Write a protein that holds these residues in place. Structure first.
Motif, PDB file in Angstrom:
ATOM      1  N   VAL A   1     -12.080  -7.359   8.113  1.00 19.35           N
ATOM      2  CA  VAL A   1     -10.945  -6.672   7.497  1.00 19.35           C
ATOM      3  C   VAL A   1     -10.158  -7.630   6.608  1.00 19.35           C
ATOM      4  O   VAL A   1      -9.813  -7.300   5.465  1.00 19.35           O
ATOM      5  N   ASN A   2      -9.884  -8.838   7.114  1.00 18.98           N
ATOM      6  CA  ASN A   2      -9.126  -9.819   6.338  1.00 18.98           C
ATOM      7  C   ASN A   2      -9.908 -10.329   5.129  1.00 18.98           C
ATOM      8  O   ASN A   2      -9.307 -10.684   4.109  1.00 18.98           O
ATOM      9  N   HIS A   3     -11.239 -10.371   5.224  1.00 14.96           N
ATOM     10  CA  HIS A   3     -12.068 -10.669   4.059  1.00 14.96           C
ATOM     11  C   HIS A   3     -12.107  -9.499   3.082  1.00 14.96           C
ATOM     12  O   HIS A   3     -12.010  -9.696   1.865  1.00 14.96           O
ATOM     13  N   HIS A   4     -12.249  -8.275   3.593  1.00 19.32           N
ATOM     14  CA  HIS A   4     -12.302  -7.074   2.768  1.00 19.32           C
ATOM     15  C   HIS A   4     -10.931  -6.524   2.405  1.00 19.32           C
ATOM     16  O   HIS A   4     -10.858  -5.454   1.790  1.00 19.32           O
ATOM     17  N   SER A   5      -9.847  -7.206   2.785  1.00 20.29           N
ATOM     18  CA  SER A   5      -8.539  -6.874   2.230  1.00 20.29           C
ATOM     19  C   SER A   5      -8.477  -7.176   0.737  1.00 20.29           C
ATOM     20  O   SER A   5      -7.800  -6.460  -0.011  1.00 20.29           O
ATOM     21  N   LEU A   6      -9.162  -8.234   0.294  1.00 20.23           N
ATOM     22  CA  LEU A   6      -9.401  -8.435  -1.133  1.00 20.23           C
ATOM     23  C   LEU A   6     -10.279  -7.339  -1.726  1.00 20.23           C
ATOM     24  O   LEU A   6     -10.147  -7.010  -2.911  1.00 20.23           O
ATOM     25  N   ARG A   7     -11.175  -6.764  -0.924  1.00 18.80           N
ATOM     26  CA  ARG A   7     -12.189  -5.821  -1.395  1.00 18.80           C
ATOM     27  C   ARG A   7     -11.859  -4.380  -1.029  1.00 18.80           C
ATOM     28  O   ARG A   7     -12.755  -3.603  -0.688  1.00 18.80           O
ATOM     29  N   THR A   8     -10.588  -3.988  -1.088  1.00 24.56           N
ATOM     30  CA  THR A   8     -10.173  -2.619  -0.784  1.00 24.56           C
ATOM     31  C   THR A   8      -9.516  -2.049  -2.039  1.00 24.56           C
ATOM     32  O   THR A   8      -8.290  -2.021  -2.165  1.00 24.56           O
ATOM     33  N   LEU A   9     -10.359  -1.553  -2.960  1.00 22.70           N
ATOM     34  CA  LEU A   9      -9.869  -0.940  -4.227  1.00 22.70           C
ATOM     35  C   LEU A   9     -11.013  -0.115  -4.837  1.00 22.70           C
ATOM     36  O   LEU A   9     -12.032  -0.727  -5.213  1.00 22.70           O
ATOM     37  N   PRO A  10     -10.906   1.230  -4.962  1.00 16.55           N
ATOM     38  CA  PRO A  10     -11.950   2.046  -5.587  1.00 16.55           C
ATOM     39  C   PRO A  10     -11.937   1.924  -7.102  1.00 16.55           C
ATOM     40  O   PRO A  10     -10.897   1.727  -7.735  1.00 16.55           O
ATOM     41  N   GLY A  11     -13.127   2.047  -7.686  1.00 10.63           N
ATOM     42  CA  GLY A  11     -13.252   1.993  -9.129  1.00 10.63           C
ATOM     43  C   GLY A  11     -13.941   3.201  -9.727  1.00 10.63           C
ATOM     44  O   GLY A  11     -13.615   4.342  -9.386  1.00 10.63           O
TER      45      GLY A  11
ATOM     46  N   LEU B   1      -9.203  -5.874 -13.950  1.00 12.22           N
ATOM     47  CA  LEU B   1      -9.532  -4.997 -15.068  1.00 12.22           C
ATOM     48  C   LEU B   1      -9.797  -3.573 -14.591  1.00 12.22           C
ATOM     49  O   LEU B   1      -9.350  -2.609 -15.221  1.00 12.22           O
ATOM     50  N   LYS B   2     -10.478  -3.422 -13.453  1.00 12.59           N
ATOM     51  CA  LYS B   2     -10.696  -2.087 -12.902  1.00 12.59           C
ATOM     52  C   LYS B   2      -9.418  -1.506 -12.301  1.00 12.59           C
ATOM     53  O   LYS B   2      -9.243  -0.281 -12.287  1.00 12.59           O
ATOM     54  N   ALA B   3      -8.511  -2.362 -11.822  1.00 21.54           N
ATOM     55  CA  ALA B   3      -7.217  -1.878 -11.346  1.00 21.54           C
ATOM     56  C   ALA B   3      -6.335  -1.407 -12.498  1.00 21.54           C
ATOM     57  O   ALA B   3      -5.579  -0.439 -12.349  1.00 21.54           O
ATOM     58  N   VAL B   4      -6.397  -2.094 -13.643  1.00 27.06           N
ATOM     59  CA  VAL B   4      -5.751  -1.597 -14.857  1.00 27.06           C
ATOM     60  C   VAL B   4      -6.424  -0.305 -15.328  1.00 27.06           C
ATOM     61  O   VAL B   4      -5.754   0.631 -15.783  1.00 27.06           O
TER      62      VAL B   4
ATOM     63  N   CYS C   1      -2.125  -4.077  -4.114  1.00 30.40           N
ATOM     64  CA  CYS C   1      -1.077  -3.175  -4.580  1.00 30.40           C
ATOM     65  C   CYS C   1      -1.557  -2.200  -5.651  1.00 30.40           C
ATOM     66  O   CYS C   1      -1.209  -1.020  -5.605  1.00 30.40           O
ATOM     67  N   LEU C   2      -2.310  -2.667  -6.637  1.00 33.67           N
ATOM     68  CA  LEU C   2      -2.580  -1.871  -7.840  1.00 33.67           C
ATOM     69  C   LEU C   2      -3.608  -0.713  -7.628  1.00 33.67           C
ATOM     70  O   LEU C   2      -4.015  -0.163  -8.660  1.00 33.67           O
ATOM     71  N   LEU C   3      -4.055  -0.300  -6.438  1.00 29.80           N
ATOM     72  CA  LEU C   3      -5.081   0.734  -6.338  1.00 29.80           C
ATOM     73  C   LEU C   3      -4.537   2.159  -6.267  1.00 29.80           C
ATOM     74  O   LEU C   3      -5.332   3.102  -6.335  1.00 29.80           O
ATOM     75  N   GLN C   4      -3.226   2.349  -6.086  1.00 30.90           N
ATOM     76  CA  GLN C   4      -2.713   3.690  -5.829  1.00 30.90           C
ATOM     77  C   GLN C   4      -2.664   4.559  -7.088  1.00 30.90           C
ATOM     78  O   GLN C   4      -2.542   4.047  -8.204  1.00 30.90           O
TER      79      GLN C   4
ATOM     80  N   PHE D   1       0.811  -1.212   0.000  1.00 27.94           N
ATOM     81  CA  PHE D   1       0.000   0.000   0.000  1.00 27.94           C
ATOM     82  C   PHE D   1       0.846   1.265   0.000  1.00 27.94           C
ATOM     83  O   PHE D   1       0.386   2.311  -0.472  1.00 27.94           O
ATOM     84  N   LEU D   2       2.076   1.187   0.506  1.00 31.85           N
ATOM     85  CA  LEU D   2       2.930   2.355   0.693  1.00 31.85           C
ATOM     86  C   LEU D   2       4.207   2.276  -0.136  1.00 31.85           C
ATOM     87  O   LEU D   2       5.221   2.873   0.237  1.00 31.85           O
ATOM     88  N   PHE D   3       4.186   1.531  -1.245  1.00 28.07           N
ATOM     89  CA  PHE D   3       5.280   1.573  -2.207  1.00 28.07           C
ATOM     90  C   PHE D   3       4.832   1.566  -3.661  1.00 28.07           C
ATOM     91  O   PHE D   3       5.687   1.667  -4.546  1.00 28.07           O
ATOM     92  N   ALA D   4       3.536   1.447  -3.939  1.00 27.37           N
ATOM     93  CA  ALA D   4       3.028   1.350  -5.307  1.00 27.37           C
ATOM     94  C   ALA D   4       3.177   2.623  -6.158  1.00 27.37           C
ATOM     95  O   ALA D   4       3.427   2.485  -7.363  1.00 27.37           O
TER      96      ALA D   4
END
Lengths: 444, 385
Positions: free
Chosen positions: B336-346, A227-230, A195-198, A137-140
């Motif tokens: 949190v450990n389940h939503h660690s996969l689900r932490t990404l905005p689109g 695909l949304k991360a790309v 990783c890919l969200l930053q 999270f803090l190197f991407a």
């Protein structure tokens, strides 16, 4: 509390709208307690609380603190100018990071062998999945910031972590470690998912992730969240070399065979690729140069190699997957975007501001009987204009009070050619939507 | 002429000031309909009320109707209504002239937010760049109560201050839920004073060993003000990547830094009270578990940056919690450990995220109505004088 007050003081100054004089006085006190376990000069409460826990628990308590320190320093290093020659304090801080991640499994079993060491490293990495979540999270955005010359030789023990930050193979850390087990999510797959969200990406980190995608497809064939991360790194300020490998990866991703078949599901992933294609073709300038977009040498050479044989090749391979729902996608493209960007994209595709240098008998499709032709419709221009004309005419018919005012006057010249191009080069669908009302109320 | 260019934005507000002072003869179906007028000027709508049916507010527009310079002079009665605590039990002691019994308690929250949404617009024109708005009436934001002067008069000053700020944050959160098309950037608590809004909780933090067992308000001060940290987190989420200024990423970076300085000024005294006693581990981490449950509900990017800055320090003495708090802590950690996969905005998930956020806003605003009404009622029980 005591280590959680000392490191809280060493961390809270970096987490501030302004960074004082404590950015150099904090990394001296980081290689003191962690690298060579010197307890001198600091508070004796830290010396009391270090011997009540293990040597690994200091790492488990100190990793997010100096991680947020390094993240707030690399995000500030863009402005102060240490992009090629690194300072001493940040060198010390990255040496602490590469001690507590790489050399801490070495001495963690030495201060207090393949299967028993595996159980010992499992006991070491019990709660590691919340901290390697923050490590990715803090190197991407900070992948290309540390140059290879900026990567010092005090970090030479930590090459085996950061030399896989440019090819993205499997590194030598246990928190980053047969076709079905690749679909089972390991620590590495959930880490590259985190990783890919930053934001703030560039050529080397995106090329790193793209080479990872190439290696993963080579491992797989020989899901829309990636695909949304790309998409999060393909709606930003896109360049030439990245959209090269991005068009190669949509070439490799369309051929997976996970196509939305609408002809074989009635007896009981596509639109985002299209808007990546549209943004790539729009952002690469217009096909003859008049309009907005990237201008120069890199803007010009990718319309006869990469628009013409990496974007249009992708759309020609994409039209051989389905024949029905592309009109809905390009219809939603028409009602989502304004006038000048559609003008730019259709100048990048058709090239309409210059006159059609053809003869006056462009009518080879100009009949109702000859819809079965596959010359221009198998090309990309005809199928894109066929899927956008039936919605752009309804747009300009619902916006009649916007175009016939002379304030769009120069743009009123542009459409003066553009539909004329759809009259000239695309007379098939021109004649089709010219008398589609008979297909709408008299084909019953 | 000016008497006529702002004519009907002046005749109604003279009864609005006396309805909010609770003396006019008017039903609640027609009471919020007068506040609808001052909300219909800037293209805005109020919160969802249950005393109003689904056929009353279905014909109100948002045109510019000359009611923007008539509320900036009557903005002090907004702070007069939301400043004191005693008015919310006085709401259910005057408006009992209707026969609708299921719709009584929630309007105790719906009349504070119905003014605080209006107070989130005229302050923003004062607080665009220089903050001339809040420095004229209530300047305690720039002049915070310091760390080592915590007393009972300072406690009842500071908890009323933070109730003012949390109700204004609820008003702006209703202003960014149904009507997020304001070009004036809604800044009730600006980030330049974000080093001082963290100082408004240090008084309740170290004063909480000594100012808790007087009444029930003193006890749930940590439940009146640790929802405010969640409101600050979602306000930093709404204003960090906001579309009001030219810079979008560095403003987000300094907003992240301001949120991190606020959290690292409010968290070590919570952990200090955790390390003091082990029944304090229950009594305090009930509020800590409820605020991280609200953080799981909102799913902000500030929360995921503070996940390993709490859980390795909290789970080191996990066995000294209470009965339900251990199960709640393990459930939040597994989510949190389940939503660690689900932490990404689109680009399309934030629509359903904000629909869940406005349903959660209505639910926890009804819950703040219940908490404040119960706290005021049992505090008048504790103070029967």
């Amino acid at each position: 509390l005591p280590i959680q007050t000392f490191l809280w003081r060493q961390t809270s100054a970096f987490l501030r709208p302004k960074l004082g004089k404590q950015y150099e006085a904090s990394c001296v006190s980081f290689e003191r307690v962690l690298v060579e376990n010197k307890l001198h000069g600091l508070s004796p409460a830290l010396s009391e609380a270090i011997q009540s826990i293990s040597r690994w628990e200091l790492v488990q308590a100190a990793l997010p603190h100096v991680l947020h320190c390094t993240a707030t320093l690399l995000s500030n290093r863009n402005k102060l100018g240490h992009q090629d020659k690194l300072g001493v304090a940040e060198t010390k801080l990255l040496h602490t990071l590469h001690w507590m991640l790489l050399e801490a499994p070495q001495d963690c079993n030495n201060e207090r062998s393949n299967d028993e060491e595996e159980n010992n490293r499992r006991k070491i990495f019990q709660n590691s999945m919340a901290t390697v979540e923050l490590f990715v999270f803090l190197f991407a955005p900070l992948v290309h910031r540390i140059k290879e010359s900026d990567l010092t030789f005090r970090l030479a023990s930590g090459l085996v972590i950061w030399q896989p930050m440019w090819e993205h193979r499997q590194p030598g850390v246990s928190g980053f470690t047969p076709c079905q087990r690749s679909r089972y999510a390991t620590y590495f797959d959930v880490a590259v998912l985190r990783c890919l969200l930053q934001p703030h990406w560039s050529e080397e980190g995106t090329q790193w992730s793209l080479m990872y995608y190439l290696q993963r497809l080579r491992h797989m064939l020989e899901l829309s969240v990636v695909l949304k991360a790309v998409y999060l790194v393909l709606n930003h300020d896109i360049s030439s070399r990245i959209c090269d490998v991005a068009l190669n990866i949509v070439e490799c991703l369309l051929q997976l065979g996970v196509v939305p078949c609408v002809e074989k599901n009635r007896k009981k992933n596509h639109r985002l690729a299209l808007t990546m294609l549209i943004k790539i073709v729009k952002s690469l300038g217009c096909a003859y140069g008049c309009g907005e977009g990237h201008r120069g040498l890199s803007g010009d050479r990718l319309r006869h190699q990469v628009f013409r044989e990496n974007a249009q090749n992708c759309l020609t391979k994409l039209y051989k997957l389905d024949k029905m729902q592309f009109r809905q996608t390009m219809r939603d493209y028409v009602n989502k975007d304004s006038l000048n960007n559609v003008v730019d994209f259709l100048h990048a595709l058709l090239g309409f501001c210059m006159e059609p240098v053809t003869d006056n008998k462009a009518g080879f499709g100009n009949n109702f009987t000859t819809v079965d032709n596959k010359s221009t419709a198998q090309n990309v221009e005809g199928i894109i204009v066929s899927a956008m004309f039936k919605s752009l005419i309804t747009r300009c018919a619902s916006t009649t009070h916007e175009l016939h005012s002379p304030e769009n006057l120069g743009l009123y010249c542009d459409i003066r050619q553009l539909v004329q191009f759809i009259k000239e080069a695309h007379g098939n669908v021109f004649r089709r939507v010219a008398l589609s009302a008979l297909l709408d109320s008299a084909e019953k | 002429k000016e008497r006529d260019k702002f004519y009907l934005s002046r005749s109604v507000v003279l009864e609005l000031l006396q309805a909010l002072k609770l003396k006019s003869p008017l039903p609640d179906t027609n009471l919020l309909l007068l506040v609808q007028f001052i909300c219909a000027d800037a293209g805005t709508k109020l919160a969802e009320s249950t005393i109003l049916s689904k056929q009353m507010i279905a014909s109100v527009p948002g045109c510019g109707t000359a009611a923007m310079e008539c509320v900036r002079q009557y903005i002090n009665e907004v702070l007069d209504f939301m400043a004191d605590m005693h008015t919310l039990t006085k709401l259910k002691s005057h408006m009992k002239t209707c026969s609708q019994p299921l719709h009584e308690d929630t309007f105790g929250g719906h009349l504070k937010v119905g003014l605080a949404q209006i107070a989130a617009m005229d302050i923003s024109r004062g607080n665009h760049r220089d903050n001339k708005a809040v420095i004229r009436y209530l300047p305690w934001l720039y002049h915070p109560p310091s760390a080592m002067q915590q007393g009972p008069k300072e406690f009842i000053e500071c908890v009323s201050h933070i109730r003012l700020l949390s109700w204004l944050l609820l008003g702006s959160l209703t202003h960014n839920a149904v009507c997020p098309n304001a070009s004036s950037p809604c800044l009730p608590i600006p980030l330049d004073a974000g080093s001082h809004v963290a100082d408004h909780l240090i008084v309740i933090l170290i004063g909480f060993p000594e100012q808790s067992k007087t009444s029930v308000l003193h006890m749930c001060s940590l439940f009146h003000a640790f929802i405010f940290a969640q409101l600050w987190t979602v306000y930093c989420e709404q204003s960090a990547v906001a579309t009001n200024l030219q810079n979008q990423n560095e403003f987000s970076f300094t907003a992240i830094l301001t949120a991190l300085e606020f959290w690292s000024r409010v968290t070590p005294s919570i952990l200090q009270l955790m390390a003091h006693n082990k029944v304090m581990v229950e009594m305090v981490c009930l509020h800590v578990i409820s605020l991280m449950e609200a953080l799981q509900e909102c799913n902000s990017t500030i929360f995921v940056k503070l996940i390993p800055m709490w859980l390795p320090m909290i789970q080191s003495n996990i066995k000294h919690l209470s009965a339900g708090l251990q199960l709640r802590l393990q459930a939040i950690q597994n989510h949190v450990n389940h939503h660690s996969l689900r932490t990404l905005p689109g680009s399309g998930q934030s629509s359903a995220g904000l629909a869940a956020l406005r349903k959660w806003l209505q639910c926890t605003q009804f819950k703040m109505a219940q908490v404040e009404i119960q706290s005021s009622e049992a505090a008048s029980q504790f103070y029967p004088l």
